[PDB]
Amino acid sequence: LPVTVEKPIPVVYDLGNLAAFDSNVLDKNDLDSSNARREEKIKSLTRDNVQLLINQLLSLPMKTTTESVGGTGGQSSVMTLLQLPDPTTDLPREKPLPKAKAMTKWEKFAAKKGIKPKERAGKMIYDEASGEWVPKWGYKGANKKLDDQWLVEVIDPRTLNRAERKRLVKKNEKQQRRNMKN
């Protein structure tokens, strides 16, 4: 029913990982294995550790949104949640940092001649005859209009159009490897 508990050593808080560090003297025979009077020596220290922890936790600022129904990625307005600091204790990172960078031999050519990158706007070209849009590749692509239309105007020609793309598709695939090497 009293609340505030002192200790001989100022207990370090790490609130980011929700941590508590008593550094006081651990008496040996109080922690004897065959000692029946053990659990209270465990628990009374522990609940005095915990009570001090929440007092720092309740000494924090908190969030109060005013949103409502269908709060998609947030709290309710009746929720009021603890603004935490960063985990200061530096834990071992699992995996090394992934920096897989190269110049890819295009960017070099983009470096010399300053070809700026394009807008990346959209897939849809405008067609004439018909007046529709009918985007470039993905469905009824502007590429494969030649192989599907019904005449030629001067050995099949349409499979040649399939073949020359299979050069140029695989030329991506050939230029894929050499930048994967270097």
């Binding site: 309740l58 908190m62 269908g70 990625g73 709290q75 309710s76 009746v78 009021t80 949640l81």
Partner: protein
């Protein structure tokens, strides 16, 4: 004809899946909800239908296996004045409305949370193994605690009276199923035509002299009666537990001891080996 090598190789599934009762795959989403946003305790509203009974429970999530915050039964309804059609559409609303008023009372917002405080309450809904069909009476349980005030977030598609070609809901047809008017309609559909099946069905209403227009008055009267008293009086528990114990033990077949089966082993080779 199955080999003994296969008798070592097969993997037994979980008993709760070997019984046709629980999908863990569905339950798996109900454990790992977000959870990288926050640590907010997840509450599960479990609704089950056997024949002739309705079970609805708010169930927590516990490593011990679960803790149930509250329970509501269809046989609690004659305490509140419903005698027939215990498994209909309407009792599910009556069940759903019940448990919310009941659980608010033990919650006690009317009648640790520091820094405001009141904190309205949400439970998410267990489906169970029931098919998700619109107008089904399982979602009638969803309708009750919603009107009871439990914020189970949902949408209105599976509610009855949901139009297909347009995203419209009929509150007027919804009102009839809550008060069970379609039953009392089909009471009157069977009273005038084919009394012989109508002799069979509705016989308790024929026993109690209960007609169609009274049925709509039954529930609506009984609703605020639930809202008066949801407070879960449990049974008087006749024939206390040992009386239930020993009577079942008069029908309880036991294993045999090894000292008996050795006499049963020795009974064979004297009989089935020593020339009859």
């Amino acid at each position: 004809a199955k080999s003994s090598a296969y008798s070592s190789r097969f993997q037994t599934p979980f008993r709760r899946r070997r019984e046709g009762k629980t999908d863990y795959y569905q339950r798996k989403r109900l454990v790992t909800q977000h959870k990288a946003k926050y640590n907010t305790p997840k509450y599960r509203l479990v609704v089950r239908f056997t024949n002739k009974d309705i079970i609805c429970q708010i169930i927590s999530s516990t490593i011990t296996g679960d803790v149930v915050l509250a329970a509501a039964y269809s046989h609690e309804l004659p305490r509140y004045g419903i005698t027939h059609g215990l498994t209909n559409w309407a009792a599910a609303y009556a069940t759903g409305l019940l448990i919310a008023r009941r659980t608010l009372q033990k919650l006690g917002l009317d009648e640790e949370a520091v820094e405001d405080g009141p904190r309205p309450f949400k439970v998410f809904l267990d489906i169970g193994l029931q098919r998700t069909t619109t107008g089904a009476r399982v979602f009638g349980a969803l309708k009750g605690a919603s009107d009871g005030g439990l914020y189970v977030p949902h949408s209105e598609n599976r509610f009855p009276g949901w139009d297909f070609e347009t995203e419209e809901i009929d509150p007027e047809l919804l009102r009839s199923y809550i008060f069970g008017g379609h039953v009392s309609q089909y009471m009157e559909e069977l009273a005038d035509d084919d009394e012989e099946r109508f002799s069979e069905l509705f016989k308790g209403y024929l026993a109690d002299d209960i007609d169609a227009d009274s049925l709509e008055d039954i529930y609506t009267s009984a609703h605020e009666a639930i809202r008066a008293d949801p407070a879960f009086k449990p049974t008087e528990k006749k024939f206390t537990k040992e009386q239930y114990a020993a009577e079942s033990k008069k029908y309880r077949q036991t294993k045999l001891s090894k000292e008996e089966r050795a006499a049963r082993v020795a009974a064979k080779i004297a009989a089935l080996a020593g020339q009859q």
